[PDB]
Amino acid sequence: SKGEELFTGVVPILVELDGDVNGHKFSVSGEGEGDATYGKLTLKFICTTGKLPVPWPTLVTTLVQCFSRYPDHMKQHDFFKSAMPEGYVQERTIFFKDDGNYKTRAEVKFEGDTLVNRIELKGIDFKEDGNILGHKLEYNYNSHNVYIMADKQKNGIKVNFKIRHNIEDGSVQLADHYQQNTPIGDGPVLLPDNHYLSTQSALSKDPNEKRDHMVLLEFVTAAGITL
Amino acid sequence: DLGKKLLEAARAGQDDEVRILMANGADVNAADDVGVTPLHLAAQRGHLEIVEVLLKYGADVNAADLWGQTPLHLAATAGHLEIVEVLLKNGADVNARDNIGHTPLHLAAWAGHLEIVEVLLKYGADVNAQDKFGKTPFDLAIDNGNEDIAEVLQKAADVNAYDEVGWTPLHRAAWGHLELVEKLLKNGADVNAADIDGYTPLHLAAFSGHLEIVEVLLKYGADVNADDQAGFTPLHLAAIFGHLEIVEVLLKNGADVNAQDKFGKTPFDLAIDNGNEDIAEVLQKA
């Protein structure tokens, strides 16, 4: 494939998300850099349409696993980079416990020298005083394990993991992610063995940004295959 | 226009323009939209002469971008040894924290940069520093396969230890480290430790498809029908991923064929949906 070679250095990132949760339409745009060699992301996001109707933590997952650190002994198992530059489709269904669900379709691909994540999100069955639409999720994030599997019959991959958003009053809002990635181009891709990614994240605020924004620092690395 | 040109000169590596722009009224501490200063770009992109020039001109060695990163954080990650030494020589905070809480030592250990680790230790790096997810530079080295760094960090100075996602050494060993599993269990590792998602080492082993590890876990008392907050049992996982021998062993040790995941499927149903015709067949004799 040779698509992994497009990530040997720092890559500019562009994120564009048109969302719609219970008719509350909104748009997000993000920009920054990704460094696959060290699985690092340095991004800042903005709600281009004003106040974001849902908490920023819920969109972190939706808002480029191709920038995950795959060590040399796992090069064979990096589907994300293997589908580049044509890219891959990333579809998810995020079920929040005792609340509604997101549904996302992303086209992650290269447009020039920039890796662009263009997303379309739709949320339904959400409760106006729930943890999401009621803004009870704290502005932090947790470390998660992301379990990756080759597709049920050999075209792309599937990914499942449970996100855990902290709630102001102590409890936790789970979010079952049922992810499904498929390559856009017809070229060859790497179908990996079962493994996992170990994620880190830090949400913060630019003190000079008066808009609704999310400063994101994120470290990710694959693991689970050796020798 | 000087700030943008100085940032672009320090980025491109053009020490020609840096001293020209500084001879003009260029602010050495210019910062872009994100808090990146000419010293960040010179440090990250391996431009030693520019680092020395900027620091000589009064560049803030400890300037922090929006993500809390300093030129030392970037130099330690990018693996630029001399730049790290110079930064440390000019008053760089050896234990500055990025937004995740990484110190330069974490990043060097994360990035597999031994000589950086040695330098940072020599300049006073806190080997016991934890990021905001509980990981020490050692743990980060471990999780990334940086053995020598882990060996150096441990030397710099609980088999049931558990990180912020509930993973114990047995969870990490379950991914194809048989001898490690045997040692940990022999030393008293809790064979039924459930992580944050409710997964036990037997879940991970069945998911990873390591027969030997599954057998050892079972002969050490592993709950073959584990399912607290997990949503599956090891028999479900083994049936999803076509691990026939795993299914044989799990059944032999009392796996429940009628167990239902949180979607209502039995291991038979999962084997049917995944085309595992053999597993479905022997699961039919129940």
Numbering used by the authors:
A (entry chain B): 2 to 64, 68 to 231
B (entry chain A): 13 to 169, 177 to 305
What text does the study give?
DARPins are engineered proteins that consist of 4–5 structurally similar repeats that stack on top of each other, forming a compact protein domain. DARPins combine all potential advantages of single domain binders over antibodies: they are small in size (ca. 18 kDa), possess high biophysical stability, have very high expression yields in E. coli, can easily be genetically encoded for in vivo applications and are devoid of disulphides and hence well suited for applications where they are expressed in the reducing cytoplasm. Structural investigations showed that these DARPins bind to different but slightly overlapping epitopes.
To connect 3G124nc and either YKKD or YRLK we chose flexible GS-linkers. Therefore, two linkers of 7 and 11 aa named GS7 (GGGSGGG) and GS11 (GGGSGGGSGGG) were tested for linking 3G124nc with either YKKD or YRLK. The resulting four constructs were named gc_K7, gc_K11, gc_R7 and gc_R11 according to whether they contained YKKD or YRLK and the linker used was 7 or 11 aa long. Additionally, a variant of gc_R7 devoid of lysines (nl_gc_R7; no lysine gc_R7) was designed. All lysines, none of which were located at variable positions of the DARPin scaffold in gc_R7, were mutated to arginine, methionine or histidine. The complexes crystallized under various conditions with different unit cells and one to four complexes per asymmetric unit (AU). All GFP-clamps form 1:1 complexes with eGFP, in which the clamp indeed wraps around approximately half the eGFP molecule and creates a continuous large interaction surface, similar to the superposition of the two parental DARPins on GFP (Fig. 4(a,b and c)). The buried surface area (BSA) of the GFP-clamp complexes is 1625 ± 72 Å2. Hydrogen bonds of Trp79 from the GFP-clamp to Leu44 of eGFP, Trp79 to Leu220, Gln81 to Lys41, His114 to Gln204, Asp143 to Gln204, Asn156 to Arg73 and Phe226/230 (numbering for constructs with different linker lengths, respectively) to Asn198 seem to be the most crucial ones, since they are found in almost all complex structures. Coupling of up to three Alexa Fluor 647 molecules per GFP-clamp via maleimide chemistry was straightforward and very efficient, resulting in the triple-labelled construct 3 × AF647_gc_R7.
